[PDB]
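Reopening: cellulose binding protein still failing for me.
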Amino acid sequence: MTTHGRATHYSLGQGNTIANGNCSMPAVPADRMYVAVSSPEYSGAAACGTFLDVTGPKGTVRVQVADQCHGCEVGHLDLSEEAFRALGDFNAGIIPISYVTVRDPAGPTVAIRVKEGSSRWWAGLQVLNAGNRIDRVEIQAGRQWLPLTRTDYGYWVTPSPIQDGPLTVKVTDQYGRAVVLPGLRMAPGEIQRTASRFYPVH
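Support: Ran it again with your exact input. Result attached.
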């Protein structure tokens, strides 16, 4: 589904090592290709981590959805300066664009970052590199599953305490595909990379 609209530009700059953009990314992407999307498209942070292929005057660039543009209408992207320069003249100010959300974008394996401050009492998890929208995130409780609550800042939080010991996390994407991630540690701040993927490399 192609959206027709416009792009302006902004910058998160260097960023920090904790939370970048409303999506609270661990880092500004190294290629500096990212975007802030309108509140409806941000969709309570459900758009976080997804990718847009944006077509402008000079060609097409892929950007990671990393932020919310509160003042943007639907169809109006706030591109990183770097993405904007790739599509148009930097001094243009605003450029016409068309864009689509990328299905199953190439990328690394799934990772989980436990939010700083997390404990058995209350914890937050961020899912990295799912590629598409995440429908739900669950933590194992015995042989049941405790469902997490999607925050509007890129994490999933516990509605009630979790069990001690290694965490097993189940992540189901918008297309019903699930990954189960065993052996995760209560390691706040750490990016815990796994072997799991929702779809293959090729």
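The domain at 105-194 is CATH 2.60.40.760 (Immunoglobulin-like). If you still see a failure, please send the error message rather than a screenshot.
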